[PDB]
Design a protein around this ligand. Structure first.
Ligand SMILES: [Mg+2]
Ligand SMILES: [Mg+2]
Ligand SMILES: [Mg+2]
Ligand SMILES: [Mg+2]
Ligand SMILES: [Mg+2]
Ligand SMILES: [Mg+2]
Ligand SMILES: [Mg+2]
Ligand SMILES: [Mg+2]
Ligand SMILES: [Mg+2]
Ligand SMILES: [Mg+2]
Ligand SMILES: [Mg+2]
Ligand SMILES: [Mg+2]
Ligand SMILES: [Mg+2]
Ligand SMILES: [Mg+2]
Ligand SMILES: [Mg+2]
Ligand SMILES: [Mg+2]
Ligand SMILES: [Mg+2]
Ligand SMILES: [Mg+2]
Ligand SMILES: [Mg+2]
Ligand SMILES: [Mg+2]
Ligand SMILES: [Mg+2]
Ligand SMILES: [Mg+2]
Ligand SMILES: [Mg+2]
Ligand SMILES: [Mg+2]
Ligand SMILES: [Mg+2]
Ligand SMILES: [Mg+2]
Ligand SMILES: [Mg+2]
Ligand SMILES: [Mg+2]
Ligand SMILES: [Mg+2]
Ligand SMILES: [Mg+2]
Ligand SMILES: [Mg+2]
Ligand SMILES: [Mg+2]
Ligand SMILES: [Mg+2]
Ligand SMILES: [Mg+2]
Ligand SMILES: [Zn+2]
Ligand SMILES: [Zn+2]
Lengths: 128, 100, 97, 216, 25, 201, 91
RNA sequence: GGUGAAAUUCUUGGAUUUAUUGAAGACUAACUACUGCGAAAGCAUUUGCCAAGGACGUUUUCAUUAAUCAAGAACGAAAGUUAGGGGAUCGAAGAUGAUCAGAUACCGUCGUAGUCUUAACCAUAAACUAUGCCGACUAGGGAUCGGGUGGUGUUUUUUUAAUGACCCACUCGGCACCUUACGAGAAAUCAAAGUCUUUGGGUUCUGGGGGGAGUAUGGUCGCAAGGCUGAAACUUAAAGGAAUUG
């Protein structure tokens, strides 16, 4: 079966998309490029467009470094934040399997509390 | 299903015969009349060791009470305090033969 | 005059329940109130399973799922139409969709 | 400007013998230089692999194992068991409404001196003809169930070394032993040892590590 | 005006009349 | 002239038959007749003195040495103590946090005594009157009372002149300023009431 | 026959110095003047003299202590922090 | 980073992301529900100690010992208050970036007191069920929690009973729900908000058009903020409740 296994850690928030690949240990990252790099918008940093567009360069850089296979760990912002996956998160994962890189073992690692640390916005909400 | 200790000593107090205090227990420890000595946790290590060496000598059972001589005397149902209690006659109480 | 005989949502014999934080606006509403919706989905969503199962190693494998329990306040749930206003009588029915 | 990826070397990651497939994958470190050993940036690394990859079966689909490399030799790196966790997707699915969630944990040292915290998790189940909709436990049940599960955790871990525990977990002898003790009490669907955390590690001793690695 | 702030409005008044009465001791 | 008590600790002379008395700063709970064990192999009870390497992190200690065998330097004041943060067997070095809030790295052979200095809350009671501040410094040195520098004449001070008592130039003084220029706030990196609340990073 | 309402011991200070400091001193003065339980002899004979030192009037044991009270708050909590760390080492 | 869109802000001193380890303080997710407990406020990680509690079971005991309560007393969310500790997070004030005709705001950044704790204060919340307590009577339904009873019920282990767990029936006591309207009501609705002009079981409390006002005054408690007690002159034909059609 062979290949060589890296890990693609995809952090998709609602203002950006993160496509980050390291090896089986998170030390020594291979290729990291985000959505704000592929457009000048500030709004479209998080768009699925940039997310696909970012996963091109990673997978091009995975070949160039020689990583032929990826495990993917996907995360929202977490903590006291949204918890819902970001929009670019699906496009990025698709562009990675679409670029010829071999996938497997996907998990959702978004950090969840045991219920800590009072959340932003002050009990009356963010009202608009 | 467990009788504590003070509950045991309570029976000893109405139904038994006892003496209290460092003098009368050694007056009793010499004569052989004493089946138990209950030493307060806060009496000094010398009085503990002289009581010890009066006991191991006499083949007398030594209970190391958990508490001070204030709570010890309340446990024998007295208003003053006592550092050591000596059991002469066990009454309806089983203290000698129990786990203690 | 009184609108719902449940007032807000269900308490009836407690008198205080900790609040929860709205997931949209970050409001405070007692957990007894606060519309809650279970959110389960596949990690690969819809069209990607094709290109995911092809690019993937392993025969088969399986699709993991994202499990999230959403809490809204009354304001956001109404506005997001996670719920909507019903008729005087239809309001009484607590039965699901 | 260097494109540093022609600098670094490659090393092949080796799993413990307590597992099946012992070649995990690879990883890169910069080329050893004067006053930088590539063994330094190599050592402390920890790798999280699925136990399905390790044992080869898909019955282990969740159950991740952490693997920490203690030493590196000649392009190979020897890793030891650093812990186990449950893959949040699997964990979330097993939590459902209308049932009692019971959790328990204990901290215990093994025969070789390893201080471990191990976690357990179980859920009540309806059974057979039961027409009531929930099947919650009484508080008195959970107290005695937690007492029993921890009794077994401390017992199974106490006599054993780091490898025996590993060798016990793959078959899940603990889960079954838990179900046996608990069924006198309450139905208790699922059951797992869902996590094990390394707290304290003994002094190095390459000898035990070579006995685990190496020979085969 | 909203009944809480009219309750605040008259709370301030009462403080100021206590201060003014405190002039003459 | 010392808040906190001292406790007089009697030892046997190792190389001659005689008693050798030592004067120790009582550590709050130390008591007459208690036994006090001193050295690397001492136990972890309060009032014994250990080397700094020989205690775990989290250990709170008093009268700790700056260099080993200087018979104590850091945290001798009534109520004070030093916490051991960590150890570094590369050259025998324990790093500790000093009551000022600062973090110091000393040699793990540096001795300290288990616990805090006794004498508790002395500075929490209001002096209440000058006569109390008087007797206070009587036993200490002649630093009291203090006449303000603005109250003196230009000859007597930089705060100096008059017609209005005022400082009339910045009361923060260059570090490198010459003795007789230095009064008021000296090296101050800042001034004003801060409200910051963090005594260390 | 209750004498003072508020001041108690601090009626010695009369009107002076301001109440807030008279209150604040009331606190610590009752503490330092108070009689305490002895660890060794089990009676309440311990008095202060010379703040920091607390001796027992019966058994003559003298203990380093807090300024105006026998045990310091942060002392006793340190007392346990050490026992806690010492038991780690011997077990 | 952040937003609807921006900006203030942070960054080749490597910001953001990744990794290994550690520090602090708070919180206690999912399980968590028309479920539990407490007089109310309130109460959710484990284990140990401390005294407490309802209901149930009872051919046990005492024998009217009670019900309700001016005065009087305990407890009392949050904010706030006094000393000390703590100070991660959020965040009144303040300061900022924007929006805007203005924007002291709503949205963004920074952040003081605060939020946590010890020992003291304070005694208020739409502290709500906007519904006093004790007692009796009047109607149907199925779930659920705690206890008990009844079974040649079921499922459990070497089938051995047990104990468990489940199922069916019964019954006390609970948190609730559903139908009904004999009855009640201005109606909304109510299983009490019924058994009231055919008006009476016992008892505490409060209201008497709207304003002025919960103000003024005196008294009292409180460190203060304030609480409790609490007027009148004058003013005015409506204010208000529920339902209906636009
Ligand atoms: Mg951006
Ligand atoms: Mg903020
Ligand atoms: Mg704001
Ligand atoms: Mg809105
Ligand atoms: Mg309305
Ligand atoms: Mg309430
Ligand atoms: Mg002088
Ligand atoms: Mg001065
Ligand atoms: Mg002066
Ligand atoms: Mg002059
Ligand atoms: Mg001059
Ligand atoms: Mg000058
Ligand atoms: Mg001047
Ligand atoms: Mg002046
Ligand atoms: Mg001046
Ligand atoms: Mg008199
Ligand atoms: Mg939990
Ligand atoms: Mg429950
Ligand atoms: Mg409060
Ligand atoms: Mg407060
Ligand atoms: Mg404070
Ligand atoms: Mg703070
Ligand atoms: Mg402002
Ligand atoms: Mg203020
Ligand atoms: Mg009734
Ligand atoms: Mg019924
Ligand atoms: Mg049966
Ligand atoms: Mg079986
Ligand atoms: Mg109930
Ligand atoms: Mg009729
Ligand atoms: Mg009515
Ligand atoms: Mg009238
Ligand atoms: Mg009126
Ligand atoms: Mg009127
Ligand atoms: Zn909302
Ligand atoms: Zn004494």
């Amino acid at each position: 079966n062979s290949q060589v296994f890296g890990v693609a850690r995809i952090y998709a928030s609602f203002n950006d998309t993160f496509v980050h690949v390291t090896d089986l240990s998170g030390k020594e990252t291979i290729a990291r490029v985000t959505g704000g790099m592929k457009v000048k918008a500030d709004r479209d940093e998080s768009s699925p467009y940039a997310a696909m567009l970012a996963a091109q360069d990673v997978a091009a850089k995975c070949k160039e470094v020689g990583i032929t296979a990826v495990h993917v760990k996907i995360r929202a912002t977490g903590g006291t934040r949204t918890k819902t996956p970001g929009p670019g998160g699906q496009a990025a994962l698709r562009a990675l399997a679409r670029s010829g890189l071999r996938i497997g073992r996907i998990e959702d690692v978004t950090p969840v509390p045991s219920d800590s640390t009072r959340k932003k916005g002050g009990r009356r909400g963010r009202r608009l | 299903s467990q009788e504590s200790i003070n509950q045991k000593l309570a029976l000893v107090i109405k139904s038994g015969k006892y003496t209290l205090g460092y003098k009368s227990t050694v007056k009793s420890l010499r004569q052989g009349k004493s089946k138990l000595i209950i030493i307060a946790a806060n009496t000094p290590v010398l009085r503990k060791s002289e009581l010890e060496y009066y006991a191991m000598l006499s083949k007398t059972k030594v209970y190391y009470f958990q508490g001070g001589n204030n709570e010890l005397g309340t446990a024998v149902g007295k208003l003053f305090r006592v550092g050591v209690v000596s059991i002469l006659e066990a009454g309806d109480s089983d203290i000698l033969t129990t786990l203690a | 005059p009184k609108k719902r005989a449940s007032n807000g949502r269900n308490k009836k014999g407690r008198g205080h329940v900790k609040p929860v934080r709205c997931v949209n606006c970050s409001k405070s509403i007692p957990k007894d109130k606060a519309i809650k919706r279970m959110a389960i989905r596949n990690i690969v969503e819809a069209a990607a399973v094709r290109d995911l199962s092809e690019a993937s190693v392993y025969p088969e494998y399986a699709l993991p799922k994202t499990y999230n329990k959403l809490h809204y306040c009354v304001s956001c749930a109404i506005h997001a139409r996670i719920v909507r206003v019903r008729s005087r009588e239809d309001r009484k029915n607590r039965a699901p969709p | 400007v260097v494109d540093p990826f022609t600098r670094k070397e490659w090393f092949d990651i080796k799993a413990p013998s307590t597992f099946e497939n012992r070649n995990v994958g690879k990883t890169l470190v910069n080329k050893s230089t004067g006053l930088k050993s590539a063994s330094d940036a190599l050592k402390g690394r920890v790798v999280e692999v699925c136990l399905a990859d390790l044992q080869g079966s898909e019955d282990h689909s969740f159950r991740k194992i952490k693997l920490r490399v203690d030493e590196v030799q000649g392009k190979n790196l020897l890793t030891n068991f650093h812990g186990m966790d449950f893959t949040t997707d699997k964990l979330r699915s097993m939590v459902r409404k209308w049932q009692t969630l019971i959790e328990a944990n204990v901290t215990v040292k093994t025969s070789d001196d390893y201080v471990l915290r191990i976690f357990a998790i179980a859920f009540t189940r309806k059974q057979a003809n039961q027409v009531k909709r929930h099947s919650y436990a009484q508080s008195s049940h959970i107290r005695a169930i937690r007492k029993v599960i921890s009794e077994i955790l401390t017992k199974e871990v106490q006599g054993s070394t780091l490898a025996q525990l590993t060798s016990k977990l793959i078959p899940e002898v603990i889960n079954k032993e838990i179900e046996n003790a608990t069924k006198d009490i309450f139905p208790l669907q699922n059951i797992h040892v869902r996590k094990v955390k390394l707290l304290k590690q003994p002094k190095f001793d390459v000898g035990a590590l070579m006995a685990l690695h190496g020979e085969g | 005006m909203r009944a809480k702030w009219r309750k605040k409005r008259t709370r301030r008044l009462k403080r100021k009349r206590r201060k003014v009465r405190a002039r003459s001791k | 002239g010392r808040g906190a008590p001292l406790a007089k600790v009697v030892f046997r002379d190792p190389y001659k038959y005689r008693l050798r008395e030592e004067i120790f700063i009582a550590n709050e709970g130390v008591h007459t007749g208690q036994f006090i064990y001193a050295g690397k192999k001492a136990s972890l009870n309060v009032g014994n003195v250990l080397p700094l390497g020989s205690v775990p992190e989290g250990t709170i200690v008093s009268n700790v040495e700056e260099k080993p065998g200087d018979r104590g330097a850091l945290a001798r004041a009534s109520g004070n103590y030093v916490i051991i943060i960590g150890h570094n067997p590369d050259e025998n070095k324990t790093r500790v946090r000093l009551p000022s809030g600062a973090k110091k790295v000393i040699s793990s052979d540096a001795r300290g005594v288990i616990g805090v200095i006794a004498g508790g809350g002395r500075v929490d009671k209001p002096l209440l009157k000058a006569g109390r501040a008087f007797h206070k410094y009587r036993l200490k040195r002649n630093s009291w009372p203090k006449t303000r520098g603005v109250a003196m004449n230009p000859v007597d001070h930089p705060h100096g002149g008059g017609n209005h008592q005022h400082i009339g130039k910045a009361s923060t003084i260059s570090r490198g300023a010459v003795s007789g220029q230095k009064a008021g706030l000296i090296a101050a990196r800042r001034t004003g009431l801060l409200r910051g609340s963090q005594k260390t990073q | 026959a209750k004498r003072t309402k508020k001041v108690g011991i601090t009626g010695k200070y009369g009107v002076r110095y301001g109440s807030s400091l008279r209150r604040q001193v009331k606190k610590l003065e009752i503490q330092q003047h108070a009689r305490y339980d002895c660890s060794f002899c089990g009676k309440k004979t311990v008095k202060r003299g010379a703040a920091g030192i607390w001796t027992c009037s019966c058994c003559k044991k003298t203990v380093a202590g807090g300024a105006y009270t026998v045990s310091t708050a942060a002392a006793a909590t340190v007392r346990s922090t050490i026992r806690r760390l010492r038991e780690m080492v011997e077990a």
